[PDB]
Copies of this chain bind each other. A is one copy, B any other.
């Protein structure tokens, strides 16, 4: 059970991630998550995604280049993808026709955590 999670006011983002990792770990999942080069970071993420059984990401604005590449990685490898979208791109909305993708639309954090528990 390995999960790859593709991820001031930025404290809200950090809080939502830590809540998610905790939520996943308490359901028996293993999250594949300080001096590192882009060569090593890219190498680590790819292998982590390659080894994971479930892929979870947060597509949206501002568009993260790294996240979308990782989405492309997971979809091409045929991984199990869960996309948490707040309510986008054409390739995001039609990604399901190419790989196992489950969308979860939310407006608040509490909403997607409950929906994710159901799925």
Q: Name A's B-contacting residues (CB within 8 A).
A: 37-43, 45-46, 59, 62-66, 68-77, 88-98
Given A38-B90, A68-B69, 14 extra CB contacts under 8 A: A38-B93, A39-B94, A39-B97, A41-B91, A41-B94, A42-B94, A43-B98, A62-B63, A65-B91, A68-B72, A69-B69, A69-B75, A70-B72, A76-B76
> CA of A66 to CA of B66 in the docked complex: distance in angstroms?
12
Main DSSP-derived SS at the A contact region: helix
B72 touches A73 (CB 8 A): yes
A65 with B59: CB separation less than 8 A:
yes
Closest Cβ of chain B to A100, distance in Å, is 14
